[PDB]
Design a protein around this ligand. Structure first.
Ligand SMILES: [Pb+2]
Length: 291
């Protein structure tokens, strides 16, 4: 039986849970199914990576390029201006989520376009990443490590830059065979220089589309009908729309930002809400009982 009161990880004051009996019920299903039924579906930026460190604001995948030695101060000035005008839209309370899609497409297209101008070589990503201030959440070795040890599928589903994301996890030692990455991948020219992006754009609001266009992945995993989903946004709740059959799904949300405004909405939509939390120990605690 599961008792959240007897799990010291769940007592941390950052842990918010609207409906604990329900959460206990889901975690109980997870444990019953064991490794054989489990898979993980997860965002990356600010979910598997830190929102802030000591006492500092950490980079997203996109920020890593924004801030590197290959990008001019004027290009960063333009990128910042883009952020200021489009982030106001993203967080606009009057506009419907659907109204925001065209704007989000414009933002990722424009900002990607500025980086294509800067001339980013694939060869240089390794060093750019090594030099960056990127940080994985506390407990990531264990997270990725228990998962790989048990062969649990991990679908990292990111609106960031896939090449960057992969280099971060590769340099961290945790890009194992069980880890599949779906993101915005860079398209390179004859000289190995960035010239555009592959596929359809993934942004914060359209993860349902991507989730459905990954049929091959999810149908090989028919038997993994127990899911842990981790996300930092309302948009991330759609990441599991492609899943063949669901028996138990647990949705864990990192609330990093806009805490007062969004807490009630996050508590309503995610089963567990983690408020300004820089570690993976709640999820590690559930894997410990499960695997
Ligand atoms: Pb997200």
């Amino acid at each position: 039986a599961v008792h959240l009161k007897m799990m010291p990880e769940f007592q941390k004051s950052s842990v918010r849970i609207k409906n604990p009996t329900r959460v206990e019920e889901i975690i109980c299903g997870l444990i019953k199914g064991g490794a054989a039924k489990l898979q993980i579906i997860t965002d990356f930026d600010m979910t598997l990576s830190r929102f802030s460190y000591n006492g500092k604001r950490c980079p997203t995948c996109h920020n890593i390029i924004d801030n590197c030695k290959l990008v001019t101060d004027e290009c960063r000035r333009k990128l910042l201006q883009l952020k200021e005008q489009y982030y106001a839209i993203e967080v606009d309370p009057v506009l419907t989520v659907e109204e925001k899609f065209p704007y989000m497409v414009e933002w990722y297209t424009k900002s990607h376009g500025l980086l294509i101008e800067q001339g980013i070589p694939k060869a240089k990503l390794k060093e750019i990443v090594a030099d960056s201030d990127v940080m994985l959440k506390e407990g990531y070795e264990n997270f990725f490590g228990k998962l790989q040890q048990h062969g649990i599928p991990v679908f990292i589903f990111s609106a960031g830059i896939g090449d960057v994301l992969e280099e971060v996890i590769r340099q961290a030692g945790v890009y194992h065979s069980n880890v599949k990455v779906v993101s915005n991948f860079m398209d390179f020219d004859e000289n190995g220089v960035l010239k555009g992006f592959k596929g359809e754009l993934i942004h914060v609001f359209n993860k349902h589309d991507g989730a459905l266009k990954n049929t091959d992945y999810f149908s090989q995993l028919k038997d993994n009908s127990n899911i842990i989903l981790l996300g930092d946004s309302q948009g991330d709740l759609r990441m599991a729309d492609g899943v063949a059959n669901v028996e138990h799904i647990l949705k864990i949300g990192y609330l990093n930002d806009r805490v007062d405004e969004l807490l009630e909405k996050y508590m309503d939509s995610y089963d567990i809400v983690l408020v300004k939390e820089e570690s993976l120990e709640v999820v590690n605690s559930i894997l410990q009982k499960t695997l």
